[PDB]
Design a protein around this ligand. Structure first.
Ligand SMILES: Nc1ncnc2c1ncn2[C@@H]1O[C@H](COP(=O)(O)OP(=O)(O)OP(=O)(O)O)[C@@H](O)[C@H]1O
Ligand SMILES: Nc1ncnc2c1ncn2[C@@H]1O[C@H](COP(=O)(O)OP(=O)(O)OP(=O)(O)O)[C@@H](O)[C@H]1O
Ligand SMILES: Nc1ncnc2c1ncn2[C@@H]1O[C@H](COP(=O)(O)OP(=O)(O)O)[C@@H](O)[C@H]1O
Lengths: 496, 531
């Protein structure tokens, strides 16, 4: 609706005025409008509806690829022939000519940077200069904006750019109702099926995909019958659930990546965990509330393997903000440097389009390509990050940044520590009490073994000092060989 | 109607691809089983386009050939790709829109009662390439796509046509035809599994076994086991190649004249060794692995000491763990020790005994000669491949050499190192498991790299030192007689009791002493200098 208001208010206001005033002042009316967006947004639908809603002349619909002509010079003949009606109508009357609209589906197909050049020549010739036809509106629609010929991308031509987006939640439910009507009405639908959950499953689907899913879900019911009881042909939930495997989108999401990081779960083996969580909650409310603190930076540092990614991910999931994202070395693997810089800069720029945002950075030093014998590292990306972490967002938008590291000293060498506002230390557990909590939580052994393990450990290793991750993997591997204590204690004593 | 009442698919040649047959039947002809009234009542349209594709020689042409006779279908119209084109202007286009008249006439004639007309385009990619190729020439290579596209999308309500297009390379197809309403369903045909392999052998050897022309000795199960990566075409080639051997025993081609033993013509019979010779003749074209690991342990084991046994037991323990638990989806192990002690053979042996579906090794041998980017890409593709099968074992050989370490700079390739560092910590996709074994000889260097933190457990392989183990390996190698093996050890006991060599050097010295002078004066001499 916002685009609907913008295009109407700004572009289509000058036609409203009495023609003599326009003729006399010399105000020049906007000629070119570019609708763009991903496939399936319905650019053709909006292009059709714009003509009808403005009470304009009947649109001339022509396909982009169909412009290609067999005969030499006939493509130019067609292009010039397109304008004859509008030219003659303006000649007869002038300012009183009605609004002619021409839509060229898939403009980029033929308008790339030699039929495809002579068409551009003819269009540009008829379009500007000798002609002052303000009664013609040409609407260009393309899925790929970068392919547009640069000869047309200039002021005066396609001044106004408007974008489009896929079907959101309610609209998807409504279209689902539209397709399902015929099948639901005829009492061949089991009441067990809920349409809203099928929307909840289909997040990145376009209408054609929806039709495909409908056919496949009906199809499993088809198969159930065929290896005269046709009355019992009913479409059930299970067919819909099964048919989801066939169709596939072309989208991507990283919210899942933040949910898998905490797969191992929390254990609250110590109070300091709760203290850290409290501090994180305090900082998120602080960003939420204060209108001046528009940028907050936090460091999470500690011994390797103590467990730092999971904590930040948990805090971020607890925040409940609209926009959440993670940057990790995993995504960047295999890329060249010039690509990694651009990827990082993208991930920063896309975060400035929402009132409240949280970003998490994983294993900073690993991104920086650090190795100590040289010491060797990539300076460019380091600089990129250093600049980026001090950028204030645009007005009225707020960021919360957490980065995790394990090489505090190296960062100290780099003098980058001035970038940050506050540090949090996460020490690994050292007291056998926490081992007991972890042990009961993991239901490793009965009470007796869990009492004997502590006794055994007390007489060999008082200061325990191992990361939680190691403890978990040690428990898992000790589960199999010899569940009794005669494995486990030895293993930790080796890993002490 | 749409399938013959007398049919069960058991009789047909196609075997080993049964899931694909059910998918095609369910998604293609299912909607044309009921009376028409139901479909409109349900508001479902019919499917129009099909695509089949796979590597060369997988059986697609066999399907396309037999389906017409299979399902009581109107004789499908077969046109190979490059014949649609013609010399004269407009001839190709009219040729394309010359196929659809009969079905369309029947459609106007008889509405929805019209029977099903099937036309199959062998070799779809030949003419329907990308329609933005460019070239500034005769445009007949584009308007054909437009003609088919017009007659297939703007069909004017023709709903009784199914086109089946077969190809070997989807990528070359013009993208304009891969969209809903136009070749919606795509079916992949991949290489057969083992059971389908046996099916194919059985189908091929039917007529053979019926006419008592095969010896009872032959065992199909063994053959199916042997042919690791053979497609159906390669199997047929194997069959006839094995036959040629039996054929070439009575007729002695070239040598002598034509001597046909008319009696043995009736006793012609194939035997197992002929099949073995045939296996040696034909080779597959896919390969991947399962040979490099076997050759990596060619020298075999000797079990000269308990240490070998203990290490093997530990490896068995670990493979059991990764096989059983579902929470442990990734395990990494290091094998380190003195140079030449013998590390690679042990890991290969463990992997071979594991018997998992999926195994490969990475060695400097393969990567030789490539540019850095190529090496990065190669490793990445190998890893990405490993993330596929449910269970996976991967072996990494001589890590230091993969990273190009030389101690004078010290110079090394950082990119490869850091790529490996990130990669060895990557948990595979959901519900997949992976087991990594890496071997090295320069522990301290790795420690300086500070990359020691992504290894769950480390295994030492001390070289042998006690003269007993030397006697064991020597008796196994059969270097000399009994008295010789005794006297040499008695001499070595006092010549140099303290002893540190390894394993490889020992075998080398044994062979050299065998060649020149298997007396003491060579073997003991060299053994003494080496230690
Ligand atoms: N309070 C806690 N603090 C840290 N880890 C915890 C806590 N409670 C539970 N865990 C568990 O500790 C495990 C070990 O941490 P994790 O697997 O994230 O390794 P890590 O230390 O982040 O790795 P890295 O060495 O790269 O920093 C987590 O998988 C998580 O399930
Ligand atoms: N128990 C054993 N342990 C190791 N090798 C054995 C054993 N029994 C027999 N062998 C033989 O010893 C040889 C070991 O050589 P291998 O190539 O593994 O040495 P390596 O140390 O890996 O080589 P490099 O020094 O180049 O790294 C093989 O021929 C193997 O068959
Ligand atoms: N189930 C099968 N799978 C693969 N090939 C088979 C099978 N049964 C028989 N064959 C033999 O393999 C060949 C089929 O190859 P074909 O499909 O023509 O390869 P292409 O993929 O190049 O079309 C025929 O010679 C046929 O006799």
């Amino acid at each position: 609706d916002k685009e609907f208001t913008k295009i109407f208010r700004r572009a289509f206001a000058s036609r409203i005025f009495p023609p003599s005033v326009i003729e006399k002042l010399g105000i020049s009316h906007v000629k070119g409008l570019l609708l763009y967006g991903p496939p399936g947004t319905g650019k053709t639908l909006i292009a059709r509806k714009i003509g009808t809603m403005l009470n304009a002349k009947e649109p001339k619909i022509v396909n982009g690829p169909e412009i290609l002509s067999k005969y030499v010079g006939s493509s130019e003949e067609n292009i010039r022939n397109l304008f004859k009606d509008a030219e003659a109508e303006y000649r007869a009357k002038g300012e009183e000519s009605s609004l002619h609209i021409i839509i060229f589906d898939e403009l980029d197909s033929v308008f790339k940077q030699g039929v495809g050049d002579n068409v551009v020549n003819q269009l540009l010739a008829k379009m500007d200069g000798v002609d002052q036809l303000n009664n013609i509106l040409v609407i260009g629609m393309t899925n790929r904006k970068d392919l547009i010929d640069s000869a047309l991308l200039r002021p005066g031509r396609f001044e106004v750019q408007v974008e489009i987006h896929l079907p959101d939640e309610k609209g998807r439910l409504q279209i689902f109702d539209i397709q399902t009507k015929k099948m639901r009405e005829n009492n061949m639908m089991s009441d067990d099926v809920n349409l809203a959950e099928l929307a909840a499953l289909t997040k990145n689907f376009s209408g054609a995909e929806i039709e495909g899913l409908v056919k496949s879900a009906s199809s499993f019911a088809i198969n159930k019958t065929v290896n005269k009881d046709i009355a019992k042909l009913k479409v059930t939930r299970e067919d819909f659930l099964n048919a989801l495997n066939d169709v596939t989108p072309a989208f991507g999401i990283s919210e899942e990546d933040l949910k898998t990081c905490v797969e191992g779960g929390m254990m609250l083996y110590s109070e300091r965990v709760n203290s850290i969580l409290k501090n994180g909650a305090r900082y998120v409310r602080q960003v939420r509330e204060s209108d001046k603190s528009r940028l907050v930076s936090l460091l999470i540092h500690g011994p390797a393997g103590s467990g730092k990614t999971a904590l930040a991910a948990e805090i971020a999931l607890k925040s409940g903000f609209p926009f959440i994202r993670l940057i990790s070395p995993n995504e960047l693997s295999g890329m060249s440097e010039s690509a990694k810089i651009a990827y990082i800069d993208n991930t920063f720029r896309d975060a400035y389009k929402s009132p409240l945002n949280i970003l998490v950075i994983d294993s900073l030093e690993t991104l920086v390509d650090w190795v100590p014998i040289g010491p060797r590292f990539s300076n460019n990306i380091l600089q990129m990050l250093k600049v980026a972490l001090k950028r204030k967002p645009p007005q009225d938008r707020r960021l919360l940044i957490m980065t995790t590291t394990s090489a505090y000293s190296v960062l100290q060498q780099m003098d980058i520590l001035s970038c940050f506002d506050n540090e949090i230390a996460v020490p690994n557990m050292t007291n056998l009490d926490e081992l007991n909590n972890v042990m009961i939580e993991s239901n490793f052994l009965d009470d007796a073994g869990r009492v004997k393990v502590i006794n055994e450990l007390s007489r060999s290793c008082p200061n325990f000092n191992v990361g939680i991750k190691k403890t978990l993997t040690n428990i898992e591997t000790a589960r199999h060989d010899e569940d009794p204590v005669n494995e486990l204690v030895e293993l930790m004593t080796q890993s002490a």
